[PDB]
XYZ file of C-alpha atoms in Angstrom:
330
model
C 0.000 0.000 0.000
C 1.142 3.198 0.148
C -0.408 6.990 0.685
C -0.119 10.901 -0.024
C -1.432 13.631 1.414
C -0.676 17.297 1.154
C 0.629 19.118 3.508
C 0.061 23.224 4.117
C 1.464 26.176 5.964
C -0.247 26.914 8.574
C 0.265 30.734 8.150
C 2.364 33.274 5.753
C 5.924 32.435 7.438
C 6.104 28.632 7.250
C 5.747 28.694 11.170
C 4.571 24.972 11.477
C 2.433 22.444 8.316
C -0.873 20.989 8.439
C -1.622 17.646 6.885
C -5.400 16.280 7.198
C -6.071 13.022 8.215
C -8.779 10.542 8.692
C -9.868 9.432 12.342
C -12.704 6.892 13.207
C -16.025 5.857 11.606
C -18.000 7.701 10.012
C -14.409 9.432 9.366
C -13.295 12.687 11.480
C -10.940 14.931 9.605
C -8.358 16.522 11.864
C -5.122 18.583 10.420
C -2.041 17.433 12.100
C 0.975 18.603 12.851
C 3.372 15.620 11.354
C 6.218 15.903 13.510
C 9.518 13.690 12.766
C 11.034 14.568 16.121
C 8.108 13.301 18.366
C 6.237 9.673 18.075
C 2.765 10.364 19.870
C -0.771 10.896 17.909
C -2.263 13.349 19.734
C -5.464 14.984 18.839
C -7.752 17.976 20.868
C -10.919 16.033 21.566
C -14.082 16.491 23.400
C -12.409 15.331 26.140
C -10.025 18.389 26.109
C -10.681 21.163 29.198
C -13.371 23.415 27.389
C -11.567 26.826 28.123
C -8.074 24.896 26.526
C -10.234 24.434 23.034
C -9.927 27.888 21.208
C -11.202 27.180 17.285
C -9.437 23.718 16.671
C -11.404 21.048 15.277
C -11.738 17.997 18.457
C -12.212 14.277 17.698
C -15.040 13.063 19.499
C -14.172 9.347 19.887
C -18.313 8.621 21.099
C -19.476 9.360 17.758
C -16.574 6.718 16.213
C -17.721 3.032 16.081
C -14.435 2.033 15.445
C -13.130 3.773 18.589
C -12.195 1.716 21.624
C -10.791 3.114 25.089
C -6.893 2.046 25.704
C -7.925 0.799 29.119
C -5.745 2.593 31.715
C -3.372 3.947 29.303
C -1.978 7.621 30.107
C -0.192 9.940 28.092
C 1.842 13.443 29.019
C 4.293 15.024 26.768
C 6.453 18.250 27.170
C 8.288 19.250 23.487
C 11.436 21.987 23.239
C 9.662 24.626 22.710
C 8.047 23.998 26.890
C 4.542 23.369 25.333
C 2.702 20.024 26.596
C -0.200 18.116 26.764
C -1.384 15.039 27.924
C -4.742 12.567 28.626
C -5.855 9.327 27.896
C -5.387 7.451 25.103
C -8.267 5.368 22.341
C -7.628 3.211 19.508
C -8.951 3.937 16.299
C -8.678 3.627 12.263
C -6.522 6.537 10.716
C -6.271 7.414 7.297
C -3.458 9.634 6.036
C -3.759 10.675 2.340
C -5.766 6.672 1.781
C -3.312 4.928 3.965
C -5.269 3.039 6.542
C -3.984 1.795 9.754
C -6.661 0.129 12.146
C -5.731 -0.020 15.896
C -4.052 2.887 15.957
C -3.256 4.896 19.156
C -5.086 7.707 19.173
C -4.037 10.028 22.307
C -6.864 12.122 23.810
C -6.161 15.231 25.049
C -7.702 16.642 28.561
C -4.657 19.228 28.741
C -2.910 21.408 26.489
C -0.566 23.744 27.441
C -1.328 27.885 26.312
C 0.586 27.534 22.871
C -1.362 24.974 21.394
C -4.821 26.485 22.480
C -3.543 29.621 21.294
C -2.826 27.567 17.579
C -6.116 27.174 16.139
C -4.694 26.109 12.974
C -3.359 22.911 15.022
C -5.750 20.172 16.016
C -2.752 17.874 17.559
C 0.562 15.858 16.102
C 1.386 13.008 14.065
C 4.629 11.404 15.778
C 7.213 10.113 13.273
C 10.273 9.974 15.188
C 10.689 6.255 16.538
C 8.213 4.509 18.694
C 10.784 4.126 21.390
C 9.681 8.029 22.012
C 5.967 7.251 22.427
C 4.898 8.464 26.021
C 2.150 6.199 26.497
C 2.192 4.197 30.095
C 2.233 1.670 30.924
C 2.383 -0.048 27.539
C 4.191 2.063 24.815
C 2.762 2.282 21.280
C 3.210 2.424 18.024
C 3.699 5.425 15.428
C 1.509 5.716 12.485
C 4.206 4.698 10.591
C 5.591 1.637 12.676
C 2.180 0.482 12.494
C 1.553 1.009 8.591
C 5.365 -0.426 7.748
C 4.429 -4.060 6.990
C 1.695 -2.899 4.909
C 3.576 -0.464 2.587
C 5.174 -0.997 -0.591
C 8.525 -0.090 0.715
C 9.089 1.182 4.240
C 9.895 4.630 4.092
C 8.322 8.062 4.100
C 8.974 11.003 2.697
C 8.446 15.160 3.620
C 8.748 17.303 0.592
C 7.901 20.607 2.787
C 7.071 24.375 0.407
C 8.458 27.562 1.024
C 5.196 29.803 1.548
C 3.133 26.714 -0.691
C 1.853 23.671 -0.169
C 3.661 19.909 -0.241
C 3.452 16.620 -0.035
C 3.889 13.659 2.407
C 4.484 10.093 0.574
C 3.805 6.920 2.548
C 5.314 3.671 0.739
C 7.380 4.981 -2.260
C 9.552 7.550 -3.782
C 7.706 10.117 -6.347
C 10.693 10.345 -8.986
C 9.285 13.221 -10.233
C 9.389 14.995 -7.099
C 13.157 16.117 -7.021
C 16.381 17.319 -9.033
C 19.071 14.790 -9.673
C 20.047 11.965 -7.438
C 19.436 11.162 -3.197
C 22.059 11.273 -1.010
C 21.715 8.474 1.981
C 23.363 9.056 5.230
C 23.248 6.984 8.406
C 20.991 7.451 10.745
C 21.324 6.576 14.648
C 17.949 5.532 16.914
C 19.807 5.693 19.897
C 18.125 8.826 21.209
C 14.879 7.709 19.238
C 15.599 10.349 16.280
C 15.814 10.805 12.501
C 19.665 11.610 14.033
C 22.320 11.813 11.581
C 25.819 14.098 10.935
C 25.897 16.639 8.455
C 29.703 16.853 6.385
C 29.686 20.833 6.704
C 28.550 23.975 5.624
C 29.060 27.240 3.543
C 27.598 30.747 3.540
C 26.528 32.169 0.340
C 29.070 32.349 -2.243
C 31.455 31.166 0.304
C 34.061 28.698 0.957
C 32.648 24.832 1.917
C 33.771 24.293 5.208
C 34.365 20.353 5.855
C 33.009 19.657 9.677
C 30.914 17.305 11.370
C 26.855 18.274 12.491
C 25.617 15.665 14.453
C 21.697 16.485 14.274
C 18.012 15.778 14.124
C 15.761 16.014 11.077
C 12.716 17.437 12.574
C 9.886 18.005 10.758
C 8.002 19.774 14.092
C 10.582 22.370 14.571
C 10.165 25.500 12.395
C 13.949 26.394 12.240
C 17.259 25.440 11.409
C 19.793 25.002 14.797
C 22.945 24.702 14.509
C 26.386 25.766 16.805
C 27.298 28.801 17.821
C 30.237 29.251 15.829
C 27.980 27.806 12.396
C 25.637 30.590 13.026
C 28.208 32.970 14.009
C 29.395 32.853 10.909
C 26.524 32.798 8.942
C 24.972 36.094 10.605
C 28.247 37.975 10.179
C 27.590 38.380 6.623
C 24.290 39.990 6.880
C 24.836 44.308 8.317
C 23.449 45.146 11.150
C 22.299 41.149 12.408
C 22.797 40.533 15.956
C 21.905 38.636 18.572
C 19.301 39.686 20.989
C 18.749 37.842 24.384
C 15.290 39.965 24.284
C 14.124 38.970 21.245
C 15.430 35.136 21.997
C 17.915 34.848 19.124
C 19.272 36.630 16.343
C 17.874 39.711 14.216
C 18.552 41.273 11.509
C 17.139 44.451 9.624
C 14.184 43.550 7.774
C 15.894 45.904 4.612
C 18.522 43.203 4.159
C 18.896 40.647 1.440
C 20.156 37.320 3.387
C 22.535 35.068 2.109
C 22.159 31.528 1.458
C 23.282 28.799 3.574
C 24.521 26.103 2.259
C 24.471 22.172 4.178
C 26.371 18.756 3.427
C 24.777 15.596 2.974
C 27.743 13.165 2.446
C 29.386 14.923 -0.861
C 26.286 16.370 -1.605
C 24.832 19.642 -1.322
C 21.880 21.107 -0.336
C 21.229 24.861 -0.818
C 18.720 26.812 1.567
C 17.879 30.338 -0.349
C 18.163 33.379 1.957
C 14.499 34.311 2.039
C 13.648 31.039 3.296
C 15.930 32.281 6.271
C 13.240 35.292 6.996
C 10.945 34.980 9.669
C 9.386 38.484 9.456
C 8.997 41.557 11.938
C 9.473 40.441 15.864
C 6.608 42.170 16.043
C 3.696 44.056 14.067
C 4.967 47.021 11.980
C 9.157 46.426 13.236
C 11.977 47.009 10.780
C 14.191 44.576 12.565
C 13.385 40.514 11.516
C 14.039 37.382 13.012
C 16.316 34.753 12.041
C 15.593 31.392 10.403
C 19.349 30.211 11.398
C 19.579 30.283 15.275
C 22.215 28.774 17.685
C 21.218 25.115 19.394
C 24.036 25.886 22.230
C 21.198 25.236 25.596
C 18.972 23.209 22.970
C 21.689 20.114 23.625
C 20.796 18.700 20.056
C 21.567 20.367 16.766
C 17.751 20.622 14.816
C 17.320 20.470 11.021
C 13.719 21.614 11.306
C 11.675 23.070 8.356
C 13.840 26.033 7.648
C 16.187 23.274 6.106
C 13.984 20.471 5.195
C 11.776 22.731 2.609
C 15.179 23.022 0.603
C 15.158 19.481 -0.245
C 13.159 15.856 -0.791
C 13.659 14.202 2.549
C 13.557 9.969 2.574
C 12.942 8.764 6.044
C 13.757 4.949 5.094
C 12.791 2.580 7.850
C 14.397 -0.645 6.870
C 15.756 -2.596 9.320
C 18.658 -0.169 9.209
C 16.928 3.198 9.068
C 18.836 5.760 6.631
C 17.952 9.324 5.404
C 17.878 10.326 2.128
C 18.079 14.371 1.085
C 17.772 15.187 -2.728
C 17.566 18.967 -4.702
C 14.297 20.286 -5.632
């Protein structure tokens, strides 16, 4: 088997994508947040603390005939950014883009934390990081794709993410068509149950390769590319009047400026990120200075190639028995 779906900016700077997806019987269409550096389902539901529901579509697992409590099963998650949620958890049949996957762990919220109530955009996650992540207690489960795997025509998935337009999430094959020239696989490690892997280097704009290991995440859930001090250091010099701000929470720049691209290794390969993919708009309504799309991961502990990077290219998450990444032009 396999499946597609589209996936769609949730607002004019790329902050986070929305993918729709099938839950229960009849069918209740929720937009997810697919998230390669998580592995829980979680949806708002009408289980969900009213005053926490703000405009997000809930799943209401009494109206699903398909839906069956998880007896005694609890969930509770708390992601980088200090947002979290937790509740109870169902199984159900989800659908992604005709994929279907019956039994699947469907997490219920009752809590969500201020930044996802605030989100109406965001009716919960999709989890494709490795199961060994799920928080579900006391018996861990599956990810949507762990569960599907058997099924598909080969076991892999793949994000092909748009700058300011919409893309594409393949379950079970590789679209051809979808990207420039040939993919680049790299090795992947599970041990911290990530799409983990090590970058050769990078270069900034017209500049100079520079050979150096990255050990990082591909992370679908984050909206922007982390990477060491020094890496962004560099890359922020060569934009006038960029700085960092511990106010503002990273680094600025004036909004006047034309950014360089940034440049990252995958094996020999290379995969360019444009500068205005590195522009995250005012800090605030009607400000000439703009915030970064390059910030430093020193504090974060892991290095994060979230969307800022991942839009530049056609991502493979193969999940043979020895998971790999693939990263292709586009």
């Amino acid at each position: 088997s396999t499946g597609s779906a589209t996936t769609t900016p949730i607002d004019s700077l790329d902050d986070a994508y929305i993918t729709p997806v099938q839950i229960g019987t009849p069918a209740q269409t929720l937009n997810l947040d697919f998230d390669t550096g998580s592995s829980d389902l979680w949806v708002f539901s009408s289980e969900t603390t009213a005053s926490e529901v703000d405009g997000q579509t809930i799943y209401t697992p009494s109206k699903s005939t398909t839906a069956k409590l998880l007896s005694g099963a609890t969930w509770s998650i708390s992601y980088g950014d200090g947002s979290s949620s937790s509740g109870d958890v169902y199984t159900d049949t989800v659908s992604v883009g005709g994929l279907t996957v019956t039994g699947q762990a469907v997490e219920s919220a009752k809590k969500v934390s201020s930044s996802f109530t605030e989100d109406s955009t965001i009716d919960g996650l999709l989890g494709l990081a490795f199961s060994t992540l799920n928080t579900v207690s006391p018996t861990q489960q599956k990810t949507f794709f762990d569960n599907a795997k058997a099924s598909l025509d080969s076991p892999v998935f793949t994000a092909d993410l748009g700058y300011h337009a919409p893309g594409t999430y393949n379950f079970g094959f590789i679209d051809t068509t979808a990207y420039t020239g040939s993919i680049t696989y790299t090795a992947v490690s599970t041990k911290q149950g990530f799409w983990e892997w090590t970058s050769t280097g990078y270069a900034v704009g017209s500049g100079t390769f520079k050979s150096t290991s990255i050990d990082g995440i591909a992370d679908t859930g984050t909206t922007l590319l982390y990477l060491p001090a020094t890496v962004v250091s560099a890359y922020w010099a060569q934009v006038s009047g960029a700085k960092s701000s511990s106010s503002v929470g990273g680094y600025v720049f004036p909004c006047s400026a034309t950014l360089p691209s940034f440049t990252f290794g995958v094996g020999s390969a290379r995969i360019v990120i444009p500068g205005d993919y590195i522009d995250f708009g005012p800090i605030s309504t009607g400000s000439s200075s703009c915030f970064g799309g390059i910030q430093s991961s020193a504090g974060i502990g892991i290095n994060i190639f979230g969307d800022v990077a991942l839009k530049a290219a056609f991502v493979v998450f193969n999940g043979a028995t020895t998971p790999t990444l693939g990263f292709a032009s586009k």
